[model samples]
Target: SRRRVVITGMGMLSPLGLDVPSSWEGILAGRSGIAPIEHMDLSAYSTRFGGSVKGFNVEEYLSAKEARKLDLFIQYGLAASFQAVRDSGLEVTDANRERIGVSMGSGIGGLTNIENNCRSLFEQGPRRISPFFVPGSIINMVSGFLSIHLGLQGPNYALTTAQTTGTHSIGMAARNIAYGEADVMVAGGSEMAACGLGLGGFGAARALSTRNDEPTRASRPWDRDRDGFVLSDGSGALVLEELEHARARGARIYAELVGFGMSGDAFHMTAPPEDGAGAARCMKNALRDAGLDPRQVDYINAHGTSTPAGDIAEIAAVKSVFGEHAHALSMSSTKSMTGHLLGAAGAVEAIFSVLALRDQVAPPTINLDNPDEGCDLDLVAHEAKPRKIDVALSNSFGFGGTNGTLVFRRFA
Candidate 1:
């Protein structure tokens, strides 16, 4: 029989806030974190605003020498992992360290770092490239370094599925524990601003908001004036443990992860079909895997990135999956505030879903002053809604037509 898995602790760093309590407070208060790009020179670019994490002190999580050797994404990932592992209170002694693992990822890994090195190679020479480049900026090193730091000896790897990276990582980690491969797994994602190639690529694809004048309101999910997703940078981590393992230490359980579903659109590389057939199938699969009816889902942390086609497609997908009960459920896109964190979006949003169950409040979708056509669901727009919520779902749809859904049940 598959063992039960539950989330015992979560930690995150977002443009809105640096920790769970701070981020949660801002979400319920409808605060917007999008602003002018603070870390780079974006004046020459078409889109000058994004969700940038300000004032992150690397010394708080790593030594000065170590900080210089790794990319910003790895630094953010390590900080979140430290916070989650500390929050879980799982003593990692020699006896049990071997049973713990880590799974963290990023969609576009180390773009800024890569840009710097390429510039050095052209301007200077191959000898000018830093020796720590590959080990520091690669995707899997988040898991590799965390395993080394904490001495965890179980399965350690990363899964990168573009924007669905975090969702796939966490889902696979839960599978590891459910099958007794590991007793605990630190699963989540961290990302940095794709300021070089990513920015140029997304700009070419016309996938970013050009609301540079009003940066804070750029990510208007499902709004009549919505333009596109606002690129963001941050990380989120969750500590998942076997039910019995967590119970043995009297750990405080946040929520039980009951189901995980994944699907591929097989349509376009970046856009979903108008009917959102793949997304609908993904949610249905999650419900079937969870053995819960669609009516039982009280809230959904939507995969609404505020793009023209993507936003409308997600609304249609929800309606198709839930049918009449879609009107009864509360769905909100926290991206309306935090922008789109790309690889980190799914994990950070998953944390929000569990917290929605914890506090029984559906976080607001800010900037939705006017809903677009077909956005008739109870979107919990403009303000948080207090209600009884027993089940919550988080959706992540990525480039390359990948989609994932996670179901979280309130712990008794």
Candidate 2:
């Protein structure tokens, strides 16, 4: 058998809450974290509401001066990564420091920072740009900053695969551990892209909900009234370690990451086929990787971003992969509450999957009151569902035809 990898700890900065406990609590209560985006003037914008990170005091993670040197995405990523490390109780001395690393990233890294610099270039001059602009806005800076802060010397990198970035980063980090390249890796994704440009760009693509009246009810996955996704600013991280290392340290093991798989639609940049062939393949690949049958999966934290097409496509994908067993499994979209965190969606959803197996209860898809015609699965709708979730799957599909799936088994 391949070397086993287990999640020793998890941390999250979500629309619902700043930390894992608060976020998980909010999810269980079927609360919505989305609201109007009021920090910036959205008087002329088509869409205004979003899932912004709330009550995040950067000083809790770093000094004021130091925190100012990074982008909001990196700040959220580091905060979660540090929380995971602290939660794991892993002592990183010289002996073990070299065996630890980080794999983290953002989907739209520092769009606000870049937008600010661009304005400065036109209004003032190129010299007016801040020296920290490049380092602050770059996607890989999360991993880079975490490595420097934690003194991790093993492999450290980030993937910029849009929404799949987090899932790919975590899976690749697990591959590193399973292949003996590292004993531990902090892997996840973060994004704070509900800025002027980020939100405006997505709005231009007609991918955001215009339900400015009811922000809390705007993200209604599988609901007939669902129009589009709600952009969110958040981060999720996990401390993954080889089973032996975790056992040696008596670390708390949340779940075992048994399988990972990726696929490409190769058909469209933003839209998947209505039949969800690519997504079906992604799940099948994950099942094959885990050496599992479709019947073994008891729950799915779906990539139900609340977009009309995406929701229907995922429903079709699940039916294609699970067939008769599709009705037996409980599938829910936490996105209905937290909104879409883009790059960090997969990571946070993966954490939710692990927690589902841990608690044996699936979070609800809050606003799924009126399911669309084909969204026929047993969506844990409107309320949390307590069920047998031994093996759970998390799915994330991004633009550019990219898709990733992760299978997490409850650690025995």
By lDDT, the best candidate is 2
**Residue lDDT tens for model 1, 280-343:** 9999998998899999999999999999888898999999999989999999999999999999
Candidate 1 global CA lDDT score: 0.91
Model 2 sits at a Cα RMSD from the real structure of 0.8
Worst 10 residues of 1 by lDDT: 36-45
Worst ten-residue run, lDDT, model 2?
A: 35-44
lDDT of 2 by residue, 102-161 (tens): 999788889878888999999999999999999988988889989998899999898889
Candidate 1 ranges beyond 4 A from true positions: none
Off by over 4 Å in 2: none
